[PDB]
């Protein structure tokens, strides 16, 4: 998270920290609990083995609030396109259901085709890097503004407003950054978006997956 602040510990109990094994190495992402047995995240966070940590604040600490659960299935959207980063959404089925409490509970999803009008202030959280040189061990968060589609259409050639949201005022040094992928864009305590990609510099605007466009696949997959 660039330009944000430390979250209040356990104020975002749906937040999931993902440790991902890949052929060439290891990756880290965010995600969020949407049911006791499912975490939603970005499809580019897929790997052959994924460990999910819920209930965390300092992930570099062994905290007693933490529940560590392996993903028994990692279901990428069937039309996910690695190259254009389209349909960038993935469901993780947990090998066991979480023990729901104050530090671990799911977040609501929006209505189908629900508007997110330009100018709306949302919140994104994550354990990603805070600059091109420094990181964090504790959860951080920042408020970002939903943009008009034209702000990303003039920059990103595979941006699709039907599937994605354009987020972040260029004039604010505030963004999601490396390691924040898969975390939620929260507007009114409803997860409307998923951190996906932006410019390598971190300069906004950036592109979130639009959760409402994938509600049918989400519900079908979880059934």
């Amino acid at each position: 998270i660039i330009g944000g602040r430390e979250s209040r510990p356990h104020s975002r109990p749906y937040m999931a920290y993902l440790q991902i094994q890949s052929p060439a190495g290891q990756s880290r992402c965010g995600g969020f609990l949407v049911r006791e047995d499912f975490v939603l995240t970005a499809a580019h966070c897929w790997g052959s083995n994924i460990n999910v940590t819920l209930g965390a604040h300092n992930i570099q600490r062994r905290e007693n609030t933490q529940q560590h659960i392996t993903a028994r299935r990692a279901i990428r959207h069937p039309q996910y396109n690695q190259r254009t980063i389209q349909n960038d959404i993935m469901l993780l089925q947990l090998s066991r259901r979480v023990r729901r409490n104050r530090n671990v509970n799911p977040v609501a999803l929006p209505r189908a085709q629900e508007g997110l009008r330009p100018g709306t202030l949302c919140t994104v959280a994550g354990w990603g890097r805070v600059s091109m040189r420094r990181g964090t061990d504790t959860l951080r968060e920042v408020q970002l503004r939903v943009q008009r589609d034209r702000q990303c259409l003039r920059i990103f050639g595979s941006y699709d407003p039907r599937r994605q949201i354009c987020v972040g005022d260029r004039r604010e040094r505030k963004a999601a950054f490396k390691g924040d992928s898969g975390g939620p864009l929260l507007c009114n305590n409803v997860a409307h978006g998923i951190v996906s990609y932006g410019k390598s510099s971190g300069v906004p605007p950036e592109v979130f997956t639009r959760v409402s466009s994938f509600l049918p696949w989400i519900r079908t997959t979880m059934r």
């Binding site: 580019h44 966070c45 990603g128 920059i155 932006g198």
Partner: protein, 98 residues
């Protein structure tokens, strides 16, 4: 056990994942092996193939060394300096295609 962060910038887009190359218990590498691993993560993370690279406008990676210097390697170059490089000296790798 040895890891080096890398990022991919493709056609001006970069995902917000935090990714690393593993060097396991073998920290001594070389630029042929490293170019091979960079091409594999390019294929595995962003679906970029050898042909894609062959015909790309630009295709290179920059190794940032922890002492503060850098070295730029062309993905389409078959020339490799004959030296060994220690993974713990590398700060990060940035991959740029088009």
């Amino acid at each position: 056990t040895y890891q080096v962060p890398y990022s991919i910038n493709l056609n001006g887009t970069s995902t917000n994942i935090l990714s690393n190359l593993s060097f396991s218990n073998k920290p001594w590498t070389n630029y042929k092996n490293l170019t091979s691993q960079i091409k594999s993560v390019l294929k595995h993370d962003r679906g970029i193939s050898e042909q894609d690279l062959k015909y790309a406008k630009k295709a290179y990676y920059t190794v940032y060394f922890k002492n503060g210097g850098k070295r730029i390697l062309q993905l389409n170059s078959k020339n490799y300096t004959a030296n060994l490089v220690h993974a713990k000296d590398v700060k990060r790798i940035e991959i740029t295609v088009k």
